[PDB]
Amino acid sequence: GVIDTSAVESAITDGQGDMKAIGGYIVGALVILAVAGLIYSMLRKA
Amino acid sequence: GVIDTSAVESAITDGQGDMKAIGGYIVGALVILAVAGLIYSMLRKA
Amino acid sequence: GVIDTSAVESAITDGQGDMKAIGGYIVGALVILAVAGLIYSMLRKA
Amino acid sequence: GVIDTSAVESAITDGQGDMKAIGGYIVGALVILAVAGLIYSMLRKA
Amino acid sequence: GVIDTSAVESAITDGQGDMKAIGGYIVGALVILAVAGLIYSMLRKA
Amino acid sequence: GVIDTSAVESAITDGQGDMKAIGGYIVGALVILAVAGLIYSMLRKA
Amino acid sequence: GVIDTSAVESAITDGQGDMKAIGGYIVGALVILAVAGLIYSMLRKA
Amino acid sequence: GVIDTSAVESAITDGQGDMKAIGGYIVGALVILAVAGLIYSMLRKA
Amino acid sequence: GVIDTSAVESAITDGQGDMKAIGGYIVGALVILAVAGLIYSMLRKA
Amino acid sequence: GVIDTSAVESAITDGQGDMKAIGGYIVGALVILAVAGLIYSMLRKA
Amino acid sequence: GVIDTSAVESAITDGQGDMKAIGGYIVGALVILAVAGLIYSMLRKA
Amino acid sequence: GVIDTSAVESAITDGQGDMKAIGGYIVGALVILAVAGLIYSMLRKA
Amino acid sequence: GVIDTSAVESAITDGQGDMKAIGGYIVGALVILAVAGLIYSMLRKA
Amino acid sequence: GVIDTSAVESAITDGQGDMKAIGGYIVGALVILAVAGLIYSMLRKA
Amino acid sequence: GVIDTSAVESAITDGQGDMKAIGGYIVGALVILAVAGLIYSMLRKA
Amino acid sequence: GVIDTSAVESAITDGQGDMKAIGGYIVGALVILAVAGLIYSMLRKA
Amino acid sequence: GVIDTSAVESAITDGQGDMKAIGGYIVGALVILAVAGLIYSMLRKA
Amino acid sequence: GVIDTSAVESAITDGQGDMKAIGGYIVGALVILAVAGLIYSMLRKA
Amino acid sequence: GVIDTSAVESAITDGQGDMKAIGGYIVGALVILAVAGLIYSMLRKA
Amino acid sequence: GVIDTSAVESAITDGQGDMKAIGGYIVGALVILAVAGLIYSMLRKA
Amino acid sequence: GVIDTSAVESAITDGQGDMKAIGGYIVGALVILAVAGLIYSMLRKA
Amino acid sequence: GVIDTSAVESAITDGQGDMKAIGGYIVGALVILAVAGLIYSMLRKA
Amino acid sequence: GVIDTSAVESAITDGQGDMKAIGGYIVGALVILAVAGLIYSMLRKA
Amino acid sequence: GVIDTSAVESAITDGQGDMKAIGGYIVGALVILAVAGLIYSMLRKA
Amino acid sequence: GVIDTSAVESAITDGQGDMKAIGGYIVGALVILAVAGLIYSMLRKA
Amino acid sequence: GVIDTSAVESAITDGQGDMKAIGGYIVGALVILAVAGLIYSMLRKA
Amino acid sequence: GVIDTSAVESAITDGQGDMKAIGGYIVGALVILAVAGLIYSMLRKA
Amino acid sequence: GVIDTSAVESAITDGQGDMKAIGGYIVGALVILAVAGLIYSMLRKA
Amino acid sequence: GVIDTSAVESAITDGQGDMKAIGGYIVGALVILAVAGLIYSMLRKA
Amino acid sequence: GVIDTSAVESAITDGQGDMKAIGGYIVGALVILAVAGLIYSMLRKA
Amino acid sequence: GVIDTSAVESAITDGQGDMKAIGGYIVGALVILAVAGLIYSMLRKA
Amino acid sequence: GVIDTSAVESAITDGQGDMKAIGGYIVGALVILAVAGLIYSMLRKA
Amino acid sequence: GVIDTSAVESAITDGQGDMKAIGGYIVGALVILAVAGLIYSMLRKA
Amino acid sequence: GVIDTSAVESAITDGQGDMKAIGGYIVGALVILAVAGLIYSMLRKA
Amino acid sequence: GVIDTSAVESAITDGQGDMKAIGGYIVGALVILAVAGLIYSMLRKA
Secondary structure: OOOOOHHHHHHHHHHHHHHHHHHHHHHHHHHHHHHHHHHHHHHHHO | OOOOOHHHHHHHHHHHHHHHHHHHHHHHHHHHHHHHHHHHHHHHHO | OOOOOHHHHHHHHHHHHHHHHHHHHHHHHHHHHHHHHHHHHHHHHO | OOOOOHHHHHHHHHHHHHHHHHHHHHHHHHHHHHHHHHHHHHHHHO | OOOOOHHHHHHHHHHHHHHHHHHHHHHHHHHHHHHHHHHHHHHHHO | OOOOOHHHHHHHHHHHHHHHHHHHHHHHHHHHHHHHHHHHHHHHHO | OOOOOHHHHHHHHHHHHHHHHHHHHHHHHHHHHHHHHHHHHHHHHO | OOOOOHHHHHHHHHHHHHHHHHHHHHHHHHHHHHHHHHHHHHHHHO | OOOOOHHHHHHHHHHHHHHHHHHHHHHHHHHHHHHHHHHHHHHHHO | OOOOOHHHHHHHHHHHHHHHHHHHHHHHHHHHHHHHHHHHHHHHHO | OOOOOHHHHHHHHHHHHHHHHHHHHHHHHHHHHHHHHHHHHHHHHO | OOOOOHHHHHHHHHHHHHHHHHHHHHHHHHHHHHHHHHHHHHHHHO | OOOOOHHHHHHHHHHHHHHHHHHHHHHHHHHHHHHHHHHHHHHHHO | OOOOOHHHHHHHHHHHHHHHHHHHHHHHHHHHHHHHHHHHHHHHHO | OOOOOHHHHHHHHHHHHHHHHHHHHHHHHHHHHHHHHHHHHHHHHO | OOOOOHHHHHHHHHHHHHHHHHHHHHHHHHHHHHHHHHHHHHHHHO | OOOOOHHHHHHHHHHHHHHHHHHHHHHHHHHHHHHHHHHHHHHHHO | OOOOOHHHHHHHHHHHHHHHHHHHHHHHHHHHHHHHHHHHHHHHHO | OOOOOHHHHHHHHHHHHHHHHHHHHHHHHHHHHHHHHHHHHHHHHO | OOOOOHHHHHHHHHHHHHHHHHHHHHHHHHHHHHHHHHHHHHHHHO | OOOOOHHHHHHHHHHHHHHHHHHHHHHHHHHHHHHHHHHHHHHHHO | OOOOOHHHHHHHHHHHHHHHHHHHHHHHHHHHHHHHHHHHHHHHHO | OOOOOHHHHHHHHHHHHHHHHHHHHHHHHHHHHHHHHHHHHHHHHO | OOOOOHHHHHHHHHHHHHHHHHHHHHHHHHHHHHHHHHHHHHHHHO | OOOOOHHHHHHHHHHHHHHHHHHHHHHHHHHHHHHHHHHHHHHHHO | OOOOOHHHHHHHHHHHHHHHHHHHHHHHHHHHHHHHHHHHHHHHHO | OOOOOHHHHHHHHHHHHHHHHHHHHHHHHHHHHHHHHHHHHHHHHO | OOOOOHHHHHHHHHHHHHHHHHHHHHHHHHHHHHHHHHHHHHHHHO | OOOOOHHHHHHHHHHHHHHHHHHHHHHHHHHHHHHHHHHHHHHHHO | OOOOOHHHHHHHHHHHHHHHHHHHHHHHHHHHHHHHHHHHHHHHHO | OOOOOHHHHHHHHHHHHHHHHHHHHHHHHHHHHHHHHHHHHHHHHO | OOOOOHHHHHHHHHHHHHHHHHHHHHHHHHHHHHHHHHHHHHHHHO | OOOOOHHHHHHHHHHHHHHHHHHHHHHHHHHHHHHHHHHHHHHHHO | OOOOOHHHHHHHHHHHHHHHHHHHHHHHHHHHHHHHHHHHHHHHHO | OOOOOHHHHHHHHHHHHHHHHHHHHHHHHHHHHHHHHHHHHHHHHO
C-alpha cells in the first residue's frame, strides 16, 4: 500500500510563492497611496 | 484435490496497482484546484 | 468370480482432473470482472 | 452306471468367463457417461 | 464346446468411441454457453 | 440334499466393495464442483 | 478412456480476452466522466 | 458391426452455430443498456 | 469456437463520443455562470 | 437435420430497437433535470 | 446325415442390418432433442 | 427370407420432422421471454 | 403411418400470444416506476 | 413476434411534462429569493 | 385447447393502479421537503 | 393347402389406427403442460 | 374384429380439461406474486 | 370414467388467499422503511 | 384477486405530517438566527 | 398511465407565498436600520 | 386441505415492530446532528 | 356351448373404481405440495 | 369378487397430514429469513 | 400403517433456532455500520 | 403503523433555547463596542 | 447500434440562452445599485 | 418466533452519546473563534 | 439430528471486531479534517 | 381341500414393517438436507 | 401304501434359507446406493 | 420367515452422519463470505 | 458398510483457505479507495 | 491477466491541463478587479 | 458493541489550543495598528 | 476462521499522515494571506 502527496508538496509551495508576489506587488501600490497622501496633506497645511 | 488462487493473487495486485495510479493522478488535479483558489483569494483580498 | 472397477478408477480421476481445469480457468475470468470493477469504482469516486 | 457332467463344468465356466467380459466392457462405457456428466455440470455451474 | 464374445469386444469398443464424440462435441456447446455468460455479466457490470 | 450359496456370499461382497469405490471416487469430483463454486461466489461478491 | 477439455481451454481464453476489451473500453468512458467533472468544478470555483 | 454418429457431428455443429448467433445478438442488446447508462450518468453529473 | 465483441467496440466508442458532447456543451453553460459573476462582482466593487 | 434461429434474429432486433426508444426517451427527461439546474444555480448566484 | 443353418446365417445378417437402420435413424431424432435443448438453454440464459 | 424396415424409415423421418416443428415453435416463445426481459431491464435502469 | 402436430402449432401460438400480453402489460407497470422516479428526482434537486 | 413500447412513449412524455412544471414552478420561487436580495442590498447601501 | 390470461389482465391493472397511489402519495411528501427548503433559504438570506 | 392372414391384415390395421388416436390425443395434453409452463415462467420473470 | 378407443377419447378429453383448470388456477397465484412485487419495488424506490 | 379436480380448486384458492396476507403484511413493513426515510431526509436537510 | 394499499395511504400521510412538524419547528430556529442578526447589525451601525 | 403534479402546483405556490412574507417583513427591519442612520448622521453633522 | 399463515402474521408484526424501534431510535441521533448545527451556525454568525 | 365373462365385467369395474380413489386421493397430496410452494416463494420474494 | 382400498384411504390421509406439518413448519423458518431481512434493510438505510 | 414426522418437527425447530442466531448476530454487525456512520457524519458537519 | 417525532419536538426546542443564550450573550458584547465608541467620540470632540 | 444526443444539444443550448437572460437582467439591477451610490457619495461630499 | 433489537437499542444510544461529545467539543472551538473576533473588532475600533 | 452454528458465532464476532477497527481508525482521519478546518477558519478571520 | 396363506400374512406384515424403518430412517436424512439449506440461505442473505 | 415328502420338507427349507441370504446380502448393496446418493445430493446443494 | 434391515439402520445412520460434516463444513465457508462482506461494506462507507 | 467423507474435509478446508486470500486481498484494494478519498476530501476542504 | 490504465494517464493529464487554462485565465480577470480598485481608491483619497 | 471518541477528544482539544495561539498572536498585531494610530493622531493635533 | 485488517491499519495510518501534510502545508499559505493583510491595513491607516 502507498499514495503520493509528494506532488502536492511541490505544488502548494508554488501557491505559497505567487501569493508572495501578489502580496508584495499589492503592497507596492498602497505605498503610492500613502506617500501621495502625506504630500497632499503637506500642501494642504500650506 | 486442488484449485489455484495463485493467478488471482497476481491479478488483484494489478488492480491495486492501477488504483494507485488513478488515485495519485486524481490527486494531482485537486492540487490545481487548491492552489488556484489560494491565488484567487489572495487577489480577492487586494 | 471377479469384476474390474480398475478402469473406472483411472477414468474418474480424469474427470476430476478436467474439472480442475474448468474450475481454474473459470476463476481466471471472474478475476477480470473483479479487478475491472475496483478500477471502475476508483474512477467513479474521482 | 454313469453319466458325465464333466463337459458341463468346463462349458459353464466359459459362460461365466464371457459374462465377465461383457460385464467389464459394459462398465467401461458407463464410465464415459459418468465422467462426461461431471464435466458438463462443471461447465454448467460456470 | 465354445462361444465367441470376440465380436462383442470389437463392437462395444465402438460404442465407447462414439460416446466419446457425443461427449466431446456436447461439451463444445456448453463452452459457448459459459463464455457468452462471462461476457454478458462483464457488460452487465458496466 | 444341498445347494451352495457360499460362492454368492463371496461374490456379492465384491459388488458391495466396488460400489464403495465408485461411490467414494464419485464424491471426490462433487467436492471439486462445491469448492470451486465457493470460490466463484467469493470473487463474485468482490 | 478419454475426454477433451482441450477445446475449452482455447474457448475460455477467448472469453477472458473480450472481457479485457469490454473492461478496457468501459474504463475509457469513465475517464470522460472524471475529467469533465474536474473541469466543471474548476469553473464552479471561479 | 457399425453405428453412425456421423449425422450427430453435423447436427451438433449446427447447435453450436446458432448458439453463437443467440450469444452474439444477445450481447448486441446489453451494449445498448451499457452505453445508455454512461450517457445517463454523464447528464446525471451535470 | 468464437464470439464477437466487435460490435461492442463500435458501440462503446459512440457512448464515449456523446459523453464528449454532453461534457463539452455542459461546460459551455458553466462559463456563462463564471463570466457573469466576474461582471457582477466588478459592478459590486463600484 | 435443421433448426431455425431465423425468427430469433428478427425478434432480438426488435428488442434492440425499443431499448433504443426507452434509452433515447429516458435521456430526454434527464436533460430537463440538467437544464433546470443550470438555471436554478444561475438565479442562485444572483 | 446333414441339416442346413446356411439359410439362417443369411437371414440373421438381415436382422442385424435393419437393427442398424432402426438404431441409426433413432439416433437421428435424439440429436434434434439435444440440439434444440442447447438452443433453449442459450435463450434461457439471456 | 426378408422383412421390411422400409416403412420404418418413412415413419421415423416423420417423427424427426414434427420434432423440428415443436423445437422451432418452442424457441419462438423463449424469444418473447428474452426480448421482454431486455426491455424490462432497460426500463429498470431508468 | 401419421401423427398430428397440427394441434400443437395452434396451441403454442396461443402461448406465444399471452406471453405477449403478460410482457406488454408487465412493461406498463415499470413505466410507472420510471416516470415517478424522474419526478421524485426533479423535486429532489429543488 | 412483437412487443409494444408504444405505451412507454406516451407515459415518458408525461414524465417529461411534469418535470417541466416542477422545474418552472421551482424557478418561480428562486426569483423571489433573488429579487428580495437586490432590494435588501439596496436598503443595505443606504 | 385454451388458457386464460384474462384474470392476469385484470390483476396487473390493479398493480398499476396502487403504484399510482404510492407514486402520487410519495411525491406529496417530497413537496414538503422542497417547500420547506425554499423557506429555510429565504430566512437564511435574511 | 391354405391358411388366411387376410383377417389379420384388416385387424392389425385397426390397432395401428387407434394407436394413432391415443398418440394424437395424448399429445394434445402435453401441449397444455408446455404452454402453461411458458406462461408461468413469463409471469415468473415479472 | 373390433376394439373401442371410443371411451379413451372421452376420458382423455377430461384429462385435458382439468389440466386446463390446474393451469388456469396456478396462473392466478403467480399473478399475486407478480403484482405484489411491483408494489414492493415501488415502495422500495421511495 | 372421471377424476376430481374439485378439491384442487378449493385448495389453490387457499394458496392464493395466504399469498394475499403475506403480500399485504409484507407491504406493511416497507411502508415503515419509506416513511422513516422521508423523516430522516427531512431532519437531514435541517 | 386483490392487494391493499389502504394501509400505505394512512401511513404515508403520517410521514407527511411529521415532516410538517420538523419543517415548522426547524423554521422556528432560523427565525432566532435572523432576528438576532438584525439586532447585531443595528448595534453594529451605532 | 398517469401521475399527479397537481398537488405540487398548489404546494409550491404556498412556498412562494411565505417567501413573500419573509421577504416583505425582512425588508421592514432594514428600513429601521436605514432611517435611524440618516437620523444619526444628521445629528452627527450638528 | 389447509396450511397455516397464522404464524407468519404474528412474526411479521414483530418485524414491523423493531423497524419501528430502529426507525425511532435512528431519528433520535439525526436530531443531535440538526440541533448542534443550528447552534454552530448561531456561533458562526457572531 | 357358453362361457361367462359376466363376472369379469362386474370385477373390472371395481378395479376401475379404486383406481379412481387412488388417483383422486393421490392428487389431494400433490395439491399440498403445490400450494405450500406458492406460499414459500411468496415469503421468498419478501 | 372384491379388493380393499379402504386401507389406502386411511394411509394416504396420513401422508397428506405430515405434508401439512412439513409444509407448515417449513414456512415457519422462511418467516425468520423474511423478518430478519426487513430488519437488516432498516439498519441498512440508517 | 404409519410414518414418523416426529423427528422432523424436532430437527426443523433446530433450523429455526440457528437462523435466529445468524439473524441476531448478523444484525449486531449492521449496528456497528450504522453507529459509526452517525459519528462520521457528525465529524463531517464540523 | 406509527413513528415518533415527539422526541424531536423536545430536542429542537432545546436548540432554539441555546440559540437564545448565544444570541443574547453575543449582543451583550456589541453593547460594550457601542458604548465605548460613544465615549471615544465624546473625548474625540474635546 | 445508435443513441441520440441530438435532442440534448438543442435543449442545453436553451439552458445556455436563459442563463444569458438571467445574467443580463441581473446585471441591470446592480447598475441601479452602482449609480445610486455614486449619486449618494456626491451629495455626501457636499 | 423472535429476533432481538435489544442490542441495537444499547448500541444506538452509544452513537447518540459520542455525537453529543463531538457536538459539545466542536462548539467549544467556535467559541474561541467568536470571542477572538469580538476582541479583534474592539481593537479595530480603537 | 444436529448442525453447528457454533463456528459462526465465533467468526461473526470477528467481523464485528474489525469493523470496530475500521470504524475507529476511519474516525481518526475525519478528526484531522475537522481540526484543520477550525484552524483554517481561525486564520481566515484574521 | 385346503392351502395356508397364514404364513404369508405374517411374512408380508414384516415387509411392511421394515419398509416403515427404511421410510422413517430415509426421511431422517432429508431433514439434514432441509435444515442445512435454511441455514445456508440465512448466511447467504447476510 | 406310502410315499415320503419328508425329504422335501427338509430340502425346501434350505431353499428358503439361501433366499434369505441372497435377499439379505442383496439389500446390503442397495444401502450403499442409497447412502451415497444422500451424500451426493448433500454436496450437490452446496 | 425373516429379513434383516438391521444392517440398513447402521448404514443410513452413517449417511446421516457425513451429511452432518458436509453440512457443517459447508457452513464454515459461507461464514467467510458473510464476514468479509461486512468488512468490505464497512470500508465501502468510509 | 462405509463411505469416506474424509477427502471432503480436506478439500473444503482448501476452499475455505482461498476464500480467505480472495477476501483478504479484496480488502487490500478497498483500502486504496478509502485512503485516497480521505486525501481527496482533505484537498477538497482547502 | 491485464487491464490498461494507460489511456487514463493520458486523459487525466488533459484534465489537469485545462484546469490550468481555466485557473490562469480566471486569475487574469481578478487582476482587472484588483487594479481598478487601487485606482478607484486613489481617486477616492483625492 | 463499542466505538472510541476518545481520540477525538484529545485531537479537538489540540485544535482549540492552536486557535488560541492564532487568536492571541493575531491580536498582538492589531495592537501595533492601534498604538501607532494614537501616536499618529497625537502628532496630527500638533 | 480469520480475516486480516492488519493491512488496513497500516494503510489508514498513511492516509492520516498525508492529511497531516496537506493540512499543515495548506495552513502555511493562509498565513501569507493573514500577514499580508495586516501589512495592507497598516499602510491603509497611514
